[PDB]
Write a structure and sequence with these properties.
alpha/beta; Rossmann fold; five-stranded parallel sheet; 5 strands; globular; lipid metabolism; Platelet-activating factor acetylhydrolase IB subunit alpha1
């Protein structure tokens, strides 16, 4: 198997069960709410909710945010199969995962992303699926930049022929001419500051408004 597309939960090796607590909260959310849009993915999705761009741009859309820090594609796949898509009928599902898939080749990660789109197409066939490109990372040029770039190419190629599947590259150009990423945009060269989220969320919001 491709480990990126084999659904599996995160095993708790620390002891406080926080991952499973989050999953259960999201399952409860889906059970009790009627979102038009659901966002699912890793910390880039999760921390988008810690506003203050979420309330102005995405709350009005009737959205649920199921981002979980540290998740790889297989974790998101498992969550979608194990309750987070139940009791809802969203118009759009936004997917943003793959940067945490350490140990998986770019091809494998792409396979994971395609599995997530397929699952969504099966369980929520009426929904359009938006997949965000993986952002660059690291202060200077490094292998993860090339990897994430390659994933984006392969995913873009994969979704090109997909009527209601949309690939969005939300990168406004975080990697500068000198090859650096500014801590003003990504405070730790991975997670986005408020300043970093602005153009990303702006790009997403526009697309969501078209589709909607």
């Amino acid at each position: 198997e491709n480990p990126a597309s084999k659904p599996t939960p995160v095993q708790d090796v620390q002891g406080d069960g926080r991952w499973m607590s989050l999953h259960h909260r999201f399952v409860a959310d889906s059970k009790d709410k009627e979102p038009e849009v659901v966002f699912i993915g890793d910390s880039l999705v999760q921390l988008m909710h810690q506003s203050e761009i979420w309330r102005e741009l995405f709350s009005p859309l009737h959205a649920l945010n199921f981002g979980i820090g540290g998740d790889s594609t297989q974790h998101v796949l498992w969550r979608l199969e194990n309750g987070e898509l139940e009791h809802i009928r969203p118009k759009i599902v936004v997917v943003w995962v793959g940067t945490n898939n350490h140990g998986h080749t770019a091809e494998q990660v792409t396979g994971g992303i395609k599995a997530i789109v397929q699952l969504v197409n099966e369980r929520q066939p009426q929904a359009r699926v938006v997949v965000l490109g993986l952002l660059p990372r690291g202060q200077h040029p490094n292998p993860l930049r090339e990897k994430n770039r390659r994933v984006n190419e392969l995913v873009r190629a994969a979704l090109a022929g997909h009527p209601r599947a949309h690939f969005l590259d939300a990168d406004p150009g975080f990697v500068h001419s000198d090859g650096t990423i500014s801590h003003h945009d990504m405070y730790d060269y991975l997670h986005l500051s408020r300043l970093g989220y602005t153009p990303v969320c702006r790009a997403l919001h526009s697309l969501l408004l078209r589709l909607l």
